[PDB]
């Protein structure tokens, strides 16, 4: 019985591969040779957010592109005012091993989680003005790797137990469960319409899931190692994935295969964070070699290098208006980079 | 300066002084990571160190030795795969790796786990406090003679007791020979790589003695000293 099922699965995989080969008439590089190259991009640091007692593990931008939330593994969650470098909030955490943080689109809630397997959501607009633990979500059997707000009442959270879950804030229960990954899920990226989300795991594959339904739609296996980060394209029809194989890959939700591969001989370290700008032409990826690389999404060349961190880059984010790029690192310093004409 | 901006600056200064106090508290405390297999007596050590004091994901135990606070973190509900979350412990003071010395069949698995921890890219700068737990069980197994280490490790046949060994006065020579063979097996892997940037501290633990935490304290002291010696390039 098992042998027949395995043979049928292999036949289905071969048919999918044949269909992908048939629909791949040409590559992105072949038709992107006629576009003007971006050139050597140069960026400079504008702000240096310091004050964290330990390594910064994740950060997230607000919808106003002014307040940013960062999590440190010393047990602190700091909300900074980017423009004036002031610390708006400093929430102590019960668990000091936070690995991710999320800022609500309305800004009234901030979520965090980590090795404690608990998703802690805190208010920012309390009657007394003091922040406190609004809610705690439990049910994951693995470390909480990423979390993202959809609204003020529902949150999508990915855990190290190869499972994602859509939770309801009011009831504190898993409204929806997404399973199918064999490796630990490391990151998730919400689509602009929030109806679908892509999740990457350590099994060198990424999966697309429907928020409202709860089943996997598309699976991608271009990478050869664990996928550490994933970010949706601004149009919502594609995404980029970074892995430990020192190679970024661009996947399209319609072509159902890798379109562009970004790699270099001089780059051999893993990739930790990936993010697109507003236009999607530039892909910023953080690496373990203490610097970040900005690649051209169409030309697949090292458009720019940002070397201003003492330790490995752990997180990267781009504002909604795309005015500046925030990069965290294990050296407890959050660097804000911007371009100049 | 605007009134709203002035209020923001004042609250930022208040948060800064709160963070300064938090940093003063944080520097005094030392964080340790507890690792070991299921057969290892991690739970007994945690219970002893909690009672004596001198879904869940992770467990934290706070104990004070000589007015120094240590927070030991033990892995709770997590999957078998550990290559990812272990990177969170790249800046801990020490890693207490507890090994069941009486488990011959799974001893190779413990050796492989220790080798992986020692050779991890992000754990290269973290020392390991090795505890060879369950010494009484190992002594009883050696005295029984039903199971021989030579079958699992042929090189134990030609192994000899080190001249620097300091066994207990009323200890059987075979027991101390086997325990030092296990210690040397761990130390060969430890010295195989590292280049002196981190060190291993093997200890023999009975899972019930109160001195273990004290031992950890001593080890921590040494690490701190060596850390300073690494700052002045004296080692």
């Amino acid at each position, epitope marked *: 019985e098992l042998d027949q099922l395995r043979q049928e699965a292999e036949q289905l995989k071969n048919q999918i591969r044949d269909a992908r080969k048939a629909c791949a008439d040409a590559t992105l590089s072949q038709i992107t040779n006629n576009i003007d190259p971006v050139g050597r991009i140069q960026m400079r640091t504008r702000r240096t957010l310091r004050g964290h007692l330990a390594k910064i593990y994740a950060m997230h931008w607000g919808t106003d592109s002014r307040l940013l939330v960062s999590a440190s593994q010393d047990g602190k969650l700091i909300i900074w005012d980017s423009y004036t470098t002031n610390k708006v909030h400093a929430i102590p955490l019960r668990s000091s091993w936070v690995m991710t943080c999320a800022y609500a689109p309305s800004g009234n809630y901030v979520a965090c989680g980590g090795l404690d397997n608990i998703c802690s959501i805190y208010n920012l607009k309390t009657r007394e003005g003091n922040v406190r633990v609004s809610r705690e979500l439990a049910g994951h059997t693995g470390y909480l790797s990423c979390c993202r707000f959809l609204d003020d009442n529902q949150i999508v959270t990915s855990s190290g137990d190869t499972t994602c879950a859509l939770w309801d804030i009011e009831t504190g229960q898993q409204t929806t469960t997404f399973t199918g990954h*064999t*490796g630990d899920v490391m990151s998730l990226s919400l689509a602009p319409d929030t109806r679908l989300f892509v999740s990457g795991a350590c099994d060198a594959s990424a999966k697309l899931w429907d928020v409202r339904e709860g089943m996997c739609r598309q699976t991608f296996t271009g990478h*050869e*190692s664990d996928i550490n980060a994933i970010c949706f394209f601004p149009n919502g029809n594609a995404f980029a994935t970074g892995s430990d194989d020192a190679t970024c890959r661009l996947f399209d939700l319609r072509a159902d295969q890798e379109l562009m591969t970004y790699s270099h001989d001089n780059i051999i370290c*893993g990739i930790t964070s990936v993010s697109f700008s507003k236009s999607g032409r530039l892909l910023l990826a953080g690496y373990d070699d203490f610097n970040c690389n900005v690649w051209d999404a169409l030309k697949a060349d090292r458009a720019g290098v940002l070397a201003g961190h003492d330790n490995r880059v752990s997180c990267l984010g781009v504002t909604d208006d795309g005015m500046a790029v925030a990069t965290g690192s294990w050296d407890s310093f959050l660097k804000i980079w911007n371009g100049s004409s | 300066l605007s009134a709203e901006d002035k209020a923001a600056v004042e609250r930022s200064k208040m948060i800064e002084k709160q963070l300064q106090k938090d940093k003063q508290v944080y520097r005094a405390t030392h964080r340790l990571l507890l690792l070991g297999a299921d057969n290892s007596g991690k739970s007994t050590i945690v219970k002893q160190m909690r009672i004596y004091h001198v879904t869940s994901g992770i467990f934290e135990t706070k104990f004070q030795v000589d007015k120094v606070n240590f927070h030991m973190f033990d892995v709770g509900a997590q999957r078998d795969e550990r*290559r990812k979350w272990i990177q969170c412990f790249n800046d801990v003071t020490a890693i207490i790796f507890v090994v069941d010395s009486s488990d011959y069949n799974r001893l190779q*698995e413990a050796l*492989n786990d220790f080798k992986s921890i020692w050779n991890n890219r992000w754990l290269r700068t973290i020392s390991v406090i090795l505890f060879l737990n369950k010494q009484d069980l190992l002594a009883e197994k050696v005295l029984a003679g039903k199971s021989k280490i030579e079958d699992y490790f*042929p090189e134990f046949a030609r192994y000899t007791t080190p001249e620097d060994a300091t066994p207990e006065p009323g200890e059987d020579p075979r027991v101390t020979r086997a325990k030092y063979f296990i210690r040397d097996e761990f130390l060969r892997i430890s010295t195989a790589s590292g280049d002196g940037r981190h060190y291993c501290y093997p200890h023999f633990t009975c899972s019930v003695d109160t001195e273990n935490a004290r031992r950890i304290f001593n080890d921590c002291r040494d690490i701190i000293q060596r850390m300073h010696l690494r700052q002045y390039e004296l080692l």
Partner: nanobody, 128 residues
Framework: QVQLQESGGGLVQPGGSLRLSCAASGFTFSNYKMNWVRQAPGKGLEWVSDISQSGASISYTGSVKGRFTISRDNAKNTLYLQMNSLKPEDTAVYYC?????????????????????RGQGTQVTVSS
């Protein structure tokens, strides 16, 4: 997609010789360390032997040291495990495991129960 295909196994008389072959595809064979992991009936996964990218460092476990030979062919991307003087206790399902990250020496969790980067394995039964 990363996949490993194993061949070689079946009933073998005690004291004989056997060869296990592993074919690798979907990744650069030369940039990853290779390991062999066996699962005996009624027991869990255990590490057997490993060989690095260039083959300079080759290690075996205590139970198979001096008995098994592990080699790799980067041109053919083929992993060979020659076993001689087999024992009845050596019957198990054998799988090939790949290092999770390139240019990495420590195989952190190649022996996990649900490790993705491993093949289906082959049964090797030593019976008389």
């Amino acid at each position: 997609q990363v996949q490993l295909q194993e061949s070689g196994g079946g009933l073998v008389q005690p004291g004989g010789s056997l060869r296990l072959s592993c074919a690798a595809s979907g990744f650069t064979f030369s940039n990853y360390k290779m390991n062999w992991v066996r699962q005996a009936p009624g027991k869990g996964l255990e590490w057997v032997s490993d060989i690095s990218q260039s083959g300079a460092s080759i290690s075996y476990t205590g139970s198979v040291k001096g008995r098994f030979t592990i080699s790799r062919d980067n041109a053919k991307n083929t992993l060979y495990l020659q076993m001689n003087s087999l024992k009845p206790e050596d019957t198990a399902v054998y799988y090939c495991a790949r290092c999770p990250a390139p240019f990495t020496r420590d195989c952190f969790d190649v022996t996990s129960t649900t490790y993705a980067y491993r093949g289906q394995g082959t049964q090797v039964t030593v019976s008389s």
